[PDB]
C-alpha cells in the first residue's frame, strides 16, 4: 500500500529496436541508453512489487472498441503481434487483486472504466519495459496496465487525466497489502508522425513541459488538445498520460533524474520521481475509503444462491468463459457439437474445466465462475432449453421448475 | 434537438422468439403484445428521426474488453450472432453526426466513454425493437446505441447512470439540427437467471420501481447494487439503465403507458413517457454548451499538415482502417504481400480504398482518414521504413527529409 515514486519515459518502437539490435555501444544510442540507467538502477534497488503502467495501444489491441481508461485486470500479458510477429519476451504477470481494488475505488470516485484480459500489450509497454527491467526468464515486478485512448477524439481532458491520478493515489494507498508500488507514465514527448506537418518537434516546449510536470503540474491542467498539439505535435499530445502518473504522486516530488535526447522523430525523455509521502493526512482515511469502495456490494453475501460476477470471478473464469464465448463463431460451434474432444485438446482449459463442460454441470459452472450468458450459449448450441438450466440450478425437475412460473 | 419522450421496455430475447414464432395469436403472448401496442403506435405517429438506444450486450460483442459506457458511432448495425446464427432483420442505420456531438458534450462533462463501430447489435437491441418498429424492408428511424457494461462489477453507481442521463439531455438538445429524438432505456425488470436463486421476481418492487422512476426518480439515486439485486434479482439490477434514460427526459414527465407481464423468468414491462420540455431556461445555454464541447479542439484547423482522428474521421476511414488492422493477423498479412488483389476483391473496400493501398498513397491515405498506426503496420509488412513514409508525407525525397 506504499507508493515509492514514479517514472516517465517515451515509448517509441525505436527504443526496442535499438535494444534488440544491441546498439548499446553505438555513438548515437550510447548516451541514450545511459539516460535510462538511473531509472533501471532505481527500479532494481527499490524492488516495487507492482508497477502501475500507463500507456496507449497503437491501434493494435484497441481499435473497433476503443475506450478512454482501460484497466488490465488479468493474470498476465504477452507482447502483442503488431504486424511483424510476436517479440520474444517472457509474459509479465498482472495483479488482478490490486486491479480490482483500484476499479472499486475509481468507480466510487465516479470514473468510468473498461476492464480487459488476454489481449497483447503492444510496444507502448514492452519497449520501455524491456530496457528498464531484466527479463531473461521473468520480470522483476507485476504490472497493472492502464491503456488510455488518446488517439480518437474526443478524449478526456488534461484535468480528467490528472484527477484520475489523484484518485489512483488514494486507491493504491488504501490497498490493504503492505506492498510497494511504482507508477509509470509513458509516451511523449514532442512529435508528429502523420500528414504534412510530420517531423515536427519542440525541444523548448519539451523542457518546459518537463519542469512544470515535475514542480508545478497544476499549471498544465488548463491546456487543451489544440494547445498541446500546437506545442508538442499531434501525437505529442499523449503527454496527458504523464499528467495522470504525476497526479498519483505526492503533491511535491524530488526529481532524482531527467534526460532528453532527440535523435530522430521522437523526443526521448525520462524523469524519475521520488514520492515524499503525504505532507498532511488525506481528506478521507484509508479505512473509510475501503468501506466506501465496498459500499455498492456491501452485504451482497447475504443474498443466497447468487454469485456476483466481480473482477476476481472474471479472472478466475476467464479461460472457460473465453472458450464458450467462441460459440458465437459458426466453425467453432460446429466443432463443439461434432468433435468436442479435439477442440478440448487444442485448448488451454484445465482438466477440471473440460470436465465441467463435458458433464453439462450447469450449477458447477456457475460456482466455478462461468458467467450465465456463456452457459446459455452452450445450452442453445447443444439444443438444451434455458428451462432445463434453471431447473438444474434449482435442483428441480423441469415441470416442477415450470410450476414456479406463471405460464407455459 | 427535440426530445419527444422515452420508452422503457424489457429486452429478453423471449420477446423476439415469440415475435418470430408468430404468437400474436397465443393465449399467453397476445395480452403481452397488446402491451407493446401503445409504444408502437406512439413511435409510428411521432416519427423520431433517431432513437438514442440504451441497452447492455449479453457477452457477445463485449467480453474480453468490457467498458462502462460504449457509444456506437458507426454507420449501421446488423444482428449479432449470439451463438444461434444471425437473426433475419435488415441493418439499422446509426447516426455518426449525432453520436459525435453527444461524445463531445459528455466528455466536456467529464464522463469517460468508449467508441465502437461494426460489431453486431445483440438481442438487447433487436428483441424489443423488432416488436416496436416495422422492419420488413428497413427501419423507420436511425439509432445511436449506448451499450452499458452492467454485468462485470464494479459498474457505475446508480447516480452515475442518472447523471449520465442529465448530460445526455443537454447534449441532444444543443445538437444544432431540427430533428426529433426519442430515448430508449431497456432491460429489466425483476429477474435472476443464475445460481440457486434463479427464477426470483418481485412484482411489488417492479411496480414500486416503475412508479418511483416516473414521478420521483431522484428517490432512487442512493440504491446500491446490493439493494437492487436483493429487491430485483441479480440480473434485474440492470434497471440502472432505465434511470439513465429517465435522467435524459424532463424532470416532470407524462406517463402515457405502463404495462407489466410475468409469464416466465423476467418481468416484461413497458413505460411510455412524454417529454414536457423545459419549465425554466437551462443552467447553461444551448450556444454556450456547443462552445464548451468544441473547445478542446477549437483552433485545430489552424494546424496545417494535420488531420485529427475525430469520430467523423474514424467513421469515414472505418472499412480501410479495419482492413489494414487485420495485418496483425499472420495469415492476413501473408496474403496481403502475396495476393493483395485477391484479398481486395474478397473485401468490402471501395475502389477509392484499394487504389490508395495499391499505390501506397501514404498522404492520400492520411487525407482519406486512415489513421497513421495502420499505415505504420502496412509499411512494416511491406518492408518499407517509416522514413519513406514520413518523407512522402512531407513531400520530400528520403535524403532531403533526413537533413531536418
Ligand atoms: Fe503512444
Ligand atoms: Fe440485459
**B157: closest CA among B100, B91, B214, B225?**
B225
User: All 3 cell numbers of residue B175?
Assistant: 445538437
**SS in 3 state form for A202-220?**
CHHHHHHHHHHHHHCHHHH
Contact B303 A229 (CB under 8 A): yes
The answer to whether the peptide bond before residue A114 is cis (omega within 30 degrees of 0) is no
Contact B234 A112 (CB under 8 A): no
> Which residues pair with residue A407 across a beta bridge?
none
Q: Please tell me which residue of chain A has the smallest CA distance to B300.
A: A226
**Residue B145 φ then ψ, to 5°:** -90, 145
**B75: closest CA among B144, B178, B171?**
B144
CATH superfamily of B305-404: Dioxygenase LigAB, LigA subunit (1.10.700.10)
User: All 3 cell numbers of residue A225?
Assistant: 488538445
Return d(Cα B116, Cα B71) in angstroms, integer. 6
User: All 3 cell numbers of residue B46?
Assistant: 411521432
User: All 3 cell numbers of residue A13?
Assistant: 518502437
Cα dihedral A185, A188, A194, A195, rounded to 10, equals 130
Nearest CB among B59, B265, B310 relative to A374 is that of B59
Within its chain, how far is the Cα of A136 from the centroid?
23
Side-chain half-sphere CA neighbours of B377 within 13 A: 31
Side-chain half-sphere CA neighbours of A236 within 13 A: 30
How many whole angstroms from B324 Cα to the centroid of ligand 1?
Answer: 19
| Host H or E run for residue B77 | strand B76-77
Q: Which residues of A touch B237 (CB under 8 A)?
A: none
Contact B296 A226 (CB under 8 A): yes
* Contact between A214 and A245 (Cβ < 8 Å): no
* Contact between B181 and B4 (Cβ < 8 Å): yes
Return d(Cα B91, Cα A377) in angstroms, integer. 23
**Residue A114 φ then ψ, to 5°:** -120, 155
**Residue B92 φ then ψ, to 5°:** -105, 145
Q: Which residues of A touch B296 (CB under 8 A)?
A: 153-154, 157, 224-226
**A373: closest CA among B17, B61, B228?**
B61
Say whether A123 is catalytic.
yes
To the nearest whole Å, the CA of A163 is away from the closest chain B CA by 10
Using DSSP's 3-state secondary structure scheme, residue A269 falls into: strand
How many whole angstroms from A159 Cα to the centroid of ligand 1?
Answer: 19
Nearest CB among B65, B104, B390 relative to A199 is that of B390
Counting ligands in written order, which one lies closest to the CA of residue B9? 2
| Host H or E run for residue B313 | helix B311-316
Q: Which residue has the cell 498544465?
A: A220
**Residue A4 φ then ψ, to 5°:** -90, -25
CATH architecture under which domain B2-304 falls:
3-Layer(aba) Sandwich (3.40)
How many whole angstroms from A229 Cα to the centroid of ligand 1?
Answer: 14
Return d(Cα B381, Cα B390) in angstroms, integer. 16
* Contact between B56 and B145 (Cβ < 8 Å): no
Task: Report the DSSP pairing between strands B142-148 and B69-72.
Answer: antiparallel
**B151: closest CA among B273, B241, B39, B23?**
B241
Q: Do domains A2-304 and A305-408 have the same CATH topology?
A: no
Contact B298 A381 (CB under 8 A): no
Topology (CATH level 3) of domain A305-408: Protocatechuate 4,5-dioxygenase; Chain A (1.10.700)
Each domain of chain A, given as residue ranges in start order, spans: 2-304, 305-408
Task: Report the DSSP pairing between strands B268-275 and B2-9.
Answer: antiparallel
The conformation of residue B218, written as its DSSP 8-state character, comes to G
User: All 3 cell numbers of residue B292?
Assistant: 464548451
> Rounded to a whole number, what is the largest CA-CA distance in chain B?
81
Within its chain, how far is the Cα of B82 from the centroid?
17
Rounded to 5°, angle at Cα B123 from B121 and B124:
85
Q: In units of Å, what resolution does this entry have?
A: 2.1
Q: How is B142-196 classified by DSSP, letter by letter?
A: EEEEEEE--SSBS---HHHHHHHHHHHHHHHHTSSS--EEEEEEE--SS---SST
Q: How many residue contacts between A and B have a Cβ separation below 8 Å?
A: 320
User: All 3 cell numbers of residue A400?
Assistant: 416442477
Counting ligands in written order, which one lies closest to the CA of residue B15? 2
Q: What region, left, alpha or beta, does residue B201 occupy, with left being phi > 0 and alpha being psi -120 to 50 degrees?
A: beta
Contact A151 B371 (CB under 8 A): yes
Amino acid at each position: 500500500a506504499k507508493i515509492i515514486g514514479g517514472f516517465a519515459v517515451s515509448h517509441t518502437p525505436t527504443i526496442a529496436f535499438a535494444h534488440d539490435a544491441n546498439k548499446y555501444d553505438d555513438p548515437v544510442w550510447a548516451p541514450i541508453f545511459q539516460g535510462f540507467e538511473p531509472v533501471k538502477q532505481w527500479l532494481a534497488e527499490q524492488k516495487p512489487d507492482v508497477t502501475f503502467y500507463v500507456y496507449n495501444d497503437h491501434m493494435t489491441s484497441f481499435f473497433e472498441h476503443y475506450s478512454h481508461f482501460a484497466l488490465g485486470v488479468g493474470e498476465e500479458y504477452s507482447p502483442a503481434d503488431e504486424g511483424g510477429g510476436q517479440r520474444d519476451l517472457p509474459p509479465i504477470k498482472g495483479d488482478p487483486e490490486l486491479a480490482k481494488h483500484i476499479a472499486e475505488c475509481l468507480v466510487a470516485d465516479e470514473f468510468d472504466l473498461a476492464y480487459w484480459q488476454g489481449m497483447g500489450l503492444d510496444h507502448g509497454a514492452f519497449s520501455p519495459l524491456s530496457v528498464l527491467l531484466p527479463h531473461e526468464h521473468g520480470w522483476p515486478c507485476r504490472i497493472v496496465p492502464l491503456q488510455c485512448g488518446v488517439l480518437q477524439h474526443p478524449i478526456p481532458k488534461a484535468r480528467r487525466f490528472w484527477n484520475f491520478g489523484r484518485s489512483l493515489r488514494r486507491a493504491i494507498q488504501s490497498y490493504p497489502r503492505d506492498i510497494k508500488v511504482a507508477i509509470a507514465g509513458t509516451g511523449g514527448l514532442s512529435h508528429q508522425v502523420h500528414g504534412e506537418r510530420a517531423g515536427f518537434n519542440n525541444t523548448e516546449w519539451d523542457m518546459e513541459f518537463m519542469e512544470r510536470l515535475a514542480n508545478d503540474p497544476e499549471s498544465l491542467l488548463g491546456a487543451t488538445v489544440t494547445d498541446l498539439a500546437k506545442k508538442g505535435g499531434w501525437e505529442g499530445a499523449e503527454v496527458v498520460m504523464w499528467l495522470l502518473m504525476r497526479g498519483a504522486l505526492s503533491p511535491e516530488v524530488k526529481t532524482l533524474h531527467q534526460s532528453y535526447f532527440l535523435p530522430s522523430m521522437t523526443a526521448i525523455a525520462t524523469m524519475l520521481f521520488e514520492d515524499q509521502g503525504d505532507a498532511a493526512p488525506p481528506a478521507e482515511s484509508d479505512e473509510a475509503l475501503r468501506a466506501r469502495a465496498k459500499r455498492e456490494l456491501a452485504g451482497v453475501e447475504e443474498i443466497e444462491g447468487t454469485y456476483p460476477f466481480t473482477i476476481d470471478r472474471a479472472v478466475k473464469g476467464f479461460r472457460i468463459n473465453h472458450f464458450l464465448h467462441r460459440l458465437i463463431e459458426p466453425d467453432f460451434r460446429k466443432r463443439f457439437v461434432e468433435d468436442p474432444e479435439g477442440l478440448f485438446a487444442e485448448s488451454d482449459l484445465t482438466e477440471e474445466e473440460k470436465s465441467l463442460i463435458r458433464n453439462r454441470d450447469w450449477i458447477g459452472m456457475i460456482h466455478y465462475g462461468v458467467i450465465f450468458f456463456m452457459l446459455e450459449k452452450m445450452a442453445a448450441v447443444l439444443g438444451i432449453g434455458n428451462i432445463d438450466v434453471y431447473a438444474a440450478f434449482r435442483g428441480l425437475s423441469v415441470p416442477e421448475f415450470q410450476k414456479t412460473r406463471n405460464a407455459a
